[PDB]
Design an enzyme around this catalytic site. Sequence first.
Site, mmCIF file in Angstrom:
data_model
loop_
_atom_site.group_PDB
_atom_site.id
_atom_site.type_symbol
_atom_site.label_atom_id
_atom_site.label_comp_id
_atom_site.label_asym_id
_atom_site.label_seq_id
_atom_site.Cartn_x
_atom_site.Cartn_y
_atom_site.Cartn_z
ATOM 1 N N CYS A 44 0.981 -1.161 -0.036
ATOM 2 C CA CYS A 44 -0.105 -0.016 -0.091
ATOM 3 C C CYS A 44 0.669 1.291 -0.038
ATOM 4 O O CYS A 44 0.517 2.325 -0.509
ATOM 5 C CB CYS A 44 -0.771 0.002 1.295
ATOM 6 S SG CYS A 44 -2.390 -0.969 1.081
ATOM 7 N N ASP A 137 -19.197 14.008 -15.928
ATOM 8 C CA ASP A 137 -20.557 13.635 -15.648
ATOM 9 C C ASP A 137 -21.180 12.520 -14.526
ATOM 10 O O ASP A 137 -22.042 12.094 -14.313
ATOM 11 C CB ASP A 137 -21.159 13.092 -16.966
ATOM 12 C CG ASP A 137 -20.219 12.128 -17.613
ATOM 13 O OD1 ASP A 137 -20.730 11.086 -17.535
ATOM 14 O OD2 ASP A 137 -19.511 12.479 -18.484
#
Lengths: 221, 221
Positions: A44, A137
């Site tokens: 990570c 959008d």
Amino acid sequence: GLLLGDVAPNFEANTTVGRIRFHDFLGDSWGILFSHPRDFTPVCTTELGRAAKLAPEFAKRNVKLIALSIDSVEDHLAWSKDINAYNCEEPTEKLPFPIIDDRNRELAILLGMLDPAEKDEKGMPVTARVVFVFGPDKKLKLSILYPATTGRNFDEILRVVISLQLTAEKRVATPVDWKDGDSVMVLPTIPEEEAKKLFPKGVFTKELPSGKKYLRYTPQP
Amino acid sequence: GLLLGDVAPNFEANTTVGRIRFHDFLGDSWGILFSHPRDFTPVCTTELGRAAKLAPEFAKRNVKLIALSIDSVEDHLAWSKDINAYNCEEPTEKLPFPIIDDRNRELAILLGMLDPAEKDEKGMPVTARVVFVFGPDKKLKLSILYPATTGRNFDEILRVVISLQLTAEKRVATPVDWKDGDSVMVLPTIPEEEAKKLFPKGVFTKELPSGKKYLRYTPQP
């Protein structure tokens, strides 16, 4: 989970820069929401440090990144010093993108960002390695679901980002393994009339057994 | 939609190799169920042709591939003749891997494979560029979802398989952008004295401002 036509919920959540509304964070820019299992973990750390180096590229191309885990902002801010140290930057608390605290795993159930055989010592399933790509959008343009054990390709995230930004710009498509600048495919529902007037750099069609003229290449528009 | 740790739906479908059952196809082998928009399409020709060249590098690693469109098995085989011609071989209606028929769209709204934008000449949605990596335990290990505009990197689908198979064998995790051969990361749960016996090649730690010892590298076990 989430499908390709779905809309990113205007969710409210706490990050490393404070609480935000999702859409309000994005507004009129592309968004990358990616989750990572736990903080203070080895893969990570590579992942979020690779991101931080790619944030300039994602920026100038109108994309905003944002991270997510189950660990607190108390940790997120502290881990960023380690993340910054990994990248050999000055170990601040500041990252070029935020990280969401999902203490209670709310929006991780909402969005299906859960893991099998991975949890904390408290007995609670953790996040996985998901990447959501939303368009201006607010719709889902792409998503990947990676395991806790298997790390991600961020050079692949940038590649499909340019595509989504290119295929929406022009009436083309990108084939397998497509590298930025390589030739693109011509949308098979376009006749040779409108085609040659769209791609003045030429359209080049191979011939195939069934004599169909769909396999049409052309340099990057 | 679909999530991780979900047993692959043991479906029955008619393919280019016959009507067979899913777990019955895989058996005890890792499985990649990938989809594609529509046959006789310029991008999906680059795709499946790449998948056929790569087919031995999967079976070498015990991975049987199977494809899926919303098209007819007749259209498959006639296109499979155009596929092999794409990569300059014998234009046979034969491929290294089965292509699933799904005109009735049963497996497309079930698995969350429907593409919002692209549809067929009759107004019905076509499949998207979905990949389902299933383990031998039938459970989902990795998924990626791409639009019909953006074409998959199959070199990456091979990248994750190798890691998924190493990470199920040895107690490591592959970092960001990891290539086969490279050094892996040591699991956080593994203490200092166990990490030596598990990995006799050196386990090297990165010293971090937090002061913990999680960022540990090691040669591919």
